[PDB]
Amino acid sequence: RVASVLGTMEMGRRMDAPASAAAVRAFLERGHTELDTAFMYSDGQSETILGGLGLGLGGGDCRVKIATKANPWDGKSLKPDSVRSQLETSLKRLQCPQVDLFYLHAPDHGTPVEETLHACQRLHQEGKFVELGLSNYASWEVAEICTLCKSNGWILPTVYQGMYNATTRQVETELFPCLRHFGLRFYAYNPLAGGLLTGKYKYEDKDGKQPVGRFFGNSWAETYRNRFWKEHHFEAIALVEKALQAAYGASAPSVTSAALRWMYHHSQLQGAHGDAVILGMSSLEQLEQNLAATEEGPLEPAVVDAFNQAWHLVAHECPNYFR
Amino acid sequence: RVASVLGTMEMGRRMDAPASAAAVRAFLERGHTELDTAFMYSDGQSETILGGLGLGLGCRVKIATKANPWDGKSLKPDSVRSQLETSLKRLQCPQVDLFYLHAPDHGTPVEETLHACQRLHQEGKFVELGLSNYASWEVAEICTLCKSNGWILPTVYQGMYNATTRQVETELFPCLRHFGLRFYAYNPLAGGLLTGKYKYEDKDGKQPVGRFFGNSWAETYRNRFWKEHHFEAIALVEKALQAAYGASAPSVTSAALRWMYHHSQLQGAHGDAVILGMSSLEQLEQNLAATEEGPLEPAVVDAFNQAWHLVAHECPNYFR
Ligand SMILES: NC(=O)C1=CN([C@@H]2O[C@H](COP(=O)(O)OP(=O)(O)OC[C@H]3O[C@@H](n4cnc5c(N)ncnc54)[C@H](OP(=O)(O)O)[C@@H]3O)[C@@H](O)[C@H]2O)C=CC1
Ligand SMILES: NC(=O)C1=CN([C@@H]2O[C@H](COP(=O)(O)OP(=O)(O)OC[C@H]3O[C@@H](n4cnc5c(N)ncnc54)[C@H](OP(=O)(O)O)[C@@H]3O)[C@@H](O)[C@H]2O)C=CC1
């Protein structure tokens, strides 16, 4: 019931075009339909790869849904010209006439939001995208946006893509109530905390080993460390690992499995609202493993309580869902 | 620089009219000017007492009141008007300086409520509009609706804020700054928990009569603040006060209030204020003295931060 969307951030980075195409195929073979990319992902290479799969995206002949995003970074603003330019470039790369979902990837605090939204309204009138989404906007910024659109008679956003996992729940307090009021569904990213919730790291890895991956050896590693790589977060993971052992003994699932099942079975995400989890991977084996976990059932209550105890351990230092 | 407002919730409850009048006098004698009451306080007795003090309220003294949605009164237009007009009669004044929506009415579209406030403002029944207990996102909706409709915007938000209760800092404070609302803090001592006068185990045996026991709102207040981790937090601050100042240490009450005036997100430059609470004149006088004390040693400010981190996972919601 809670849906799954395929994250394509690693396509064109760790995953070459063949690996990416196998990934999409595995995802589709499980009955899922929706793909998440962005103007910025692997410097345009993610969209380019997806556009070359012969899926016929944006066409009436297409069962696959595609989402992309414009961003304000590196001096591109979210001023009208920049929003148009990014979307049109995305359309060329994806080799499609319109995308199913277009996001504002993160806020442009230098550009009045009414300007940006007027550009989105116009681009929607032109048939460049079907639905509008927001990502990384505060609840109060979402409300302002929705209220402006209603009063101007513009397209409202209908999807919010936000940071959410078993140990990162800031979104629950104010954002989820706001979204319910304005009618936005929620797609969760960082569902394994960039990989921290696989249990494959030790806190001390940051001094010696520094294993190349999401948290080391790239341009966003330090952002990810600051987001999730905290001692209390490792204590939290250990707490959940111990609960899995105690509740299931020899038959215990992986912590990865458990962390994803939390999302689909025990989070505030509701299939009734059209909510979804955006799965991440840097390889096809990781993806296949994750897809298996999505088809697993609920967890023992003690493990759910453990995850809650885990969140309480880190809630004081939760990263902001907004930027 | 951070201002002080007098909370009048106890006027007509633990404080009779003479004690209340002496309280107002002590407050005004310190140079302060602003009083906070509400339609609901002591079943209308708070406003009535204030209205009988001959202060001429609609003038150096400023008065705020609030309409609420509770007990089946909605915040539908008729209810808003009816509450304000009754408050005006009780306060014996033609207009109030600040009128709040006390808490959200989730059964009534907010645009209805706001149109009523616009009309009542046009009539000169109140000068400024305030909000209390609305989420940051609800404040943003409201401000955006008022701008588009050409109506009076709210300019004051009255919210729950103290050294161990800081949920408002994350989203609400940024929102307020953007829309130009000043912030007035209530529960600055966590209803009295931050005086250090209680032990967690008081809930079992002693149950001392006061904010937390023996009355209709005690259970709400226990659910809000009466948590083991909160008492751990208080003890941590008391230990830091002993360490930092030794024999010269201030009271934890004095410290908690100085935090608000000197070390919180409240800014005098924005017109922000603390709403002082008391259930007696001695309490008030002790609290007023703390407002005139200076900043705290860094180590105590850090201890307060450590204390907040202890309780942040179970912080009560600032919105309703
Ligand atoms: N709107 C926004 O600001 C955001 C949008 N997104 C979108 O959401 C998608 C998902 O988020 P993402 O953060 O990638 O998801 P995750 O939290 O699941 O992190 C995924 C990473 O964790 C590791 N991992 C995943 N599965 C396994 C496994 N089974 N075993 C071992 N390691 C595993 C891999 O990292 P590694 O092997 O490198 O160590 C993978 O790259 C993205 O692809 C993107 O489309 C993502 C971030 C921000
Ligand atoms: N808009 C809203 O929803 C809210 C508005 N308010 C307003 O804010 C004002 C202040 O809030 P309030 O919670 O009262 O503020 P506090 O957090 O300071 O709580 C005040 C209570 O703490 C105790 N106390 C205060 N000073 C001392 C002292 N020096 N020594 C020992 N105990 C002390 C007394 O309780 P005890 O009975 O135990 O003696 C007093 O009644 C209220 O009067 C009201 O006007 C208040 C709450 C909600």
UniProtKB/Swiss-Prot annotation, chain A:
Biological processes per GO annotation: aldehyde metabolic process; carbohydrate metabolic process; daunorubicin metabolic process; doxorubicin metabolic process; lipid metabolic process
Function statement: Catalyzes the NADPH-dependent reduction of succinic semialdehyde to gamma-hydroxybutyrate. May have an important role in producing the neuromodulator gamma-hydroxybutyrate (GHB). Has broad substrate specificity. Has NADPH-dependent aldehyde reductase activity towards 2-carboxybenzaldehyde, 2-nitrobenzaldehyde and pyridine-2-aldehyde (in vitro). Can reduce 1,2-naphthoquinone and 9,10-phenanthrenequinone (in vitro). Can reduce the dialdehyde protein-binding form of aflatoxin B1 (AFB1) to the non-binding AFB1 dialcohol.
GO MF annotation terms: aldo-keto reductase (NADPH) activity; aldose reductase (NADPH) activity; electron transfer activity; phenanthrene-9,10-epoxide hydrolase activity
Site feature: Lowers pKa of active site Tyr: 69
Keywords carried by this UniProt record: Acetylation, Cytoplasm, Golgi apparatus, Lipid metabolism, Mitochondrion, NADP, Oxidoreductase, Phosphoprotein, Transit peptide
Subcellular location: Mitochondrion; Golgi apparatus; Cytoplasm
Family: Belongs to the aldo/keto reductase family. Aldo/keto reductase 2 subfamily.
Chain positions with N6-succinyllysine modification: 200
Residues bearing the modification N6-acetyllysine: 92
Entry-linked InterPro entries: AKR_Detox_Biosynth, NADP_OxRdtase_dom, NADP_OxRdtase_dom_sf
Main enzyme class: oxidoreductase
EC numbers on record: 1.1.1.n11
Pfam families with a match to the protein in the record: Aldo_ket_red
Self-association state and partner proteins as the record states: Homodimer.
Residue sites binding substrate per the record: 105, 224, 227, 323
Expression across tissues: Detected in brain, liver, small intestine and testis, and at lower levels in heart, prostate, skeletal muscle and spleen. Detected in kidney proximal and distal tubules, endothelial cells lining the Bowman's capsules and some cysts. Detected at low levels in lung and pancreas (at protein level). Widely expressed.
GO cellular component: a single term: cytoplasm
Species lineage: Eukaryota, Metazoa, Chordata, Craniata, Vertebrata
Active site: 41
Catalytic activity: 4-hydroxybutanoate + NADP(+) = succinate semialdehyde + NADPH + H(+)
Protein's UniProt name: Aflatoxin B1 aldehyde reductase member 2
Binding site for NADP(+): 36, 135-136, 161, 190-200, 214, 282-290
